[PDB]
DNA sequence: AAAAAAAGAGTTGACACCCGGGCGAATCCCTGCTATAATGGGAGCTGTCACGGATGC
C-alpha cells in the first residue's frame, strides 16, 4: 500500500502521541502498525 | 485495588514598533505694478443630388 510512504507525524493525532513517536524514533507507519500491543 | 503531571488555560510583566499628530522649514500661488509713441482680422468652401420644406411680393 502507498500509505506506508507517509511519515508518522503526517496525521497529527495528539501531542502525547507525537511525543512518544518522536521518542521511539519512528519515521514510517509500518513499524507502528506491526507492533499491535507488545511494543505499545 | 490507588494518585499526581506534560499540556491546556490564564495571565503578568517586558520590550519592538509603527503610523499619527505636532513643530518646524522650506517653499508654492496670487496679485499688482511696470510710464517715449504704439489705435478695425484670416481661413473656408466653390468637382453629389434630391427631397422636403421655410420665407418674400
Swiss-Prot record:
Organism annotation: Caulobacter vibrioides (strain NA1000 / CB15N) (Caulobacter crescentus)
Q: What does this protein do?
A: DNA-dependent RNA polymerase catalyzes the transcription of DNA into RNA using the four ribonucleoside triphosphates as substrates.
- Family under the similarity heading: Belongs to the RNA polymerase alpha chain family.
Q: Assembly and partners?
A: Homodimer. The RNAP catalytic core consists of 2 alpha, 1 beta, 1 beta' and 1 omega subunit. When a sigma factor is associated with the core the holoenzyme is formed, which can initiate transcription.
The protein's name: DNA-directed RNA polymerase subunit alpha
Q: Note what the entry says on domains.
A: The N-terminal domain is essential for RNAP assembly and basal transcription, whereas the C-terminal domain is involved in interaction with transcriptional regulators and with upstream promoter elements.
Amino acid at each position: 500500500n502507498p500509505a506506508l510512504l507517509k511519515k508518522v507525524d503526517e496525521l497529527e493525532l495528539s501531542v502525547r502521541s507525537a511525543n512518544c513517536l518522536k521518542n521511539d524514533n519512528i519515521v514510517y507507519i509500518g513499524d507502528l502498525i506491526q507492533k499491535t500491543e507488545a511494543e505499545m
